[PDB]
Structures are given as structure tokens and as C-alpha cells.
Amino acid sequence: MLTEGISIQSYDGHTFGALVGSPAKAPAPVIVIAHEILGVNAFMRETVSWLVDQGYAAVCPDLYARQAPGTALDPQDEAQREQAYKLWQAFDMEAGVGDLEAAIRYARHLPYSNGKVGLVGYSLGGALAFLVAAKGCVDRAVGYCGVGLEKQLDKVPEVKHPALFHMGGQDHFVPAPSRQLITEGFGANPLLQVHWYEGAGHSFARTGSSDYVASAAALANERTLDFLAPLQS
Numbered sequence: 001m002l003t004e005g006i007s008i009q010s011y012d013g014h015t016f017g018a019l020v021g022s023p024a025k026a027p028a029p030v031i032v033i034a035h036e037i038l039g040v041n042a043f044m045r046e047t048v049s050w051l052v053d054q055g056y057a058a059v060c061p062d063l064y065a066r067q068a069p070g071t072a073l074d075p076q077d078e079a080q081r082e083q084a085y086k087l088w089q090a091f092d093m094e095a096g097v098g099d100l101e102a103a104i105r106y107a108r109h110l111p112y113s114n115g116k117v118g119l120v121g122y123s124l125g126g127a128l129a130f131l132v133a134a135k136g137c138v139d140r141a142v143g144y145c146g147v148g149l150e151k152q153l154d155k156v157p158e159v160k161h162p163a164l165f166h167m168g169g170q171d172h173f174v175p176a177p178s179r180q181l182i183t184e185g186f187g188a189n190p191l192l193q194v195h196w197y198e199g200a201g202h203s204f205a206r207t208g209s210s211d212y213v214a215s216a217a218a219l220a221n222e223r224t225l226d227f228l229a230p231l232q233s
Contacts, residue, residue: 001045001072002062010102016065018103021048023057026112029231032103033060034125037088039071043206054225055232057112061103063096075209088124097131104137116231120224121146123203130155133163139231142224144205145171150178153185162191164227166220169198195223
């Protein structure tokens with residue numbers, strides 16, 4: 001689902017839509033939400049609603065629009081999960097970073113913006129959140145359950161603003177050596193935080209997922225909100 005009429009244009013003239021939640025009161029910091037591999041779906045609607053309830057505005061851009069505008073896949077359905085994996089496999093990560101940077105510039109200038117912008121990413125978006133943190137166009141970045149962080153360690157010293165990451169201890173995408181590499185590498189830069197959630201799998205914060213773990217999701221989400229709160233006026 002996207003908000004009708006919202007259009008953000010990127011570095012290369014590509015345009016894309018977004019689901020937008022205006023804040024309960026103006027002004028407010030704006031959070032750009034980077035979605036999972038399933039597009040702007042029910043979990044994104046939930047996440048927009050949650051952040052608005054917590055005193056933010058929210059913008060969730062259609063990152064798959066370079067491939068298939070308006071993707072919104074239900075992870076309960078095998079056919080739709082297969083489409084998600086096919087889209088992820090083809091996903092251009094550098095163009096994703098560019099599109100998020102465009103969405104962050106757009107968010108900064110919204111009429112109710114207090115001039116501060118955060119980024120919260122999940123899954124595909126959790127990996128993009130690190131890349132965006134390395135580029136420095138956001139005030140604070142959060143990534144849940146990103147894949148492949150252990151291959152981006154050269155970017156650790158490039159991070160110049162705070163970024164927070166939440167990672168499952170039983171995430172098959174992040175086996176023990178990868179966890180050690182991330183823990184040691186990210187540890188070198190005190191602007192980064194990475195928290196591991198023992199007993200929690202890859203999609204531990206996605207409501208409805210068989211991976212969901214209420215206690216771990218609760219702690220990760222509490223940490224996210226405390227980390228974003230300094231952006232509020």
C-alpha cells in the first residue's frame with residue numbers, strides 16, 4: 001500500500017511512491033523506513049502507525065519500483081515469498097541507497113519536519129541502513145536483521161553519526177564466524193551499536209512471523225525508541 005500522489009524523485013530521475021504517516025503534532029522528526037524483502041506490506045503499515053503513535057512522522061518508500069512498482073507481498077503465501085526472493089536477488093543495492101537518500105532529503109523538507117531525520121530498516125532494509133549510515137546523510141540509523149554486514153566492514157570507519165543494529169543469535173544468515181566478524185569490526189567505532197538477541201531467529205521482530213519472539217522484539221523496539229527519542233524537539 002502507498003499513499004496516493006506521493007512521489008519522490010531520485011539521483012537519476014527515477015521516481016517512486018511511498019506510504020506516508022503525518023505526525024500527531026507538528027513539528028516532528030521524520031523516520032524513513034526501509035522495508036524488508038516483501039515491499040510496502042502490512043508490516044510496513046504497522047511500522048508507520050507505530051512510529052506515528054510514538055511521536056514521529058514516517059515515510060516508507062517503494063524501493064522495488066525500479067523493478068516492479070507497488071510490490072506488497074504477504075509472507076504467509078508461498079507464491080508471494082518466491083516473488084520476494086526473486087526481487088531481492090535482482091535488487092540493486094547502490095540504487096537502493098540512492099533512493100533512500102532521496103527519501104531522506106524529501107523527509108527533511110516535509111512541512112511538519114523538525115529538521116531531523118532517522119532511518120529504520122528491516123531485513124533488506126537493515127542492510128541498506130548500514131550503507132546509508134556509512135554515507136552520512138541521516139541523523140541516526142537503525143537496522144534490524146540485515147544480511148551480509150560481515151562483507152561491509154570496510155565501511156565501519158566511514159560511519160560519522162549514530163547507528164544501532166539488532167541481530168538474532170539464531171539467524172542462519174549470520175553464523176558464528178560472521179557474528180564474530182561483525183561484533184569485532186563494528187565494535188571499533190563507538191558510534192555503532194550492535195545487539196544480539198539470543199534464541200531469536202532472522203525475523204524475530206516481524207509480527208506474524210514464525211520467527212517472532214515477543215520478548216526480543218520488545219527489547220529491540222524499546223532500544224529503537226530510546227535511540228530515536230533525541231531527534232524529538
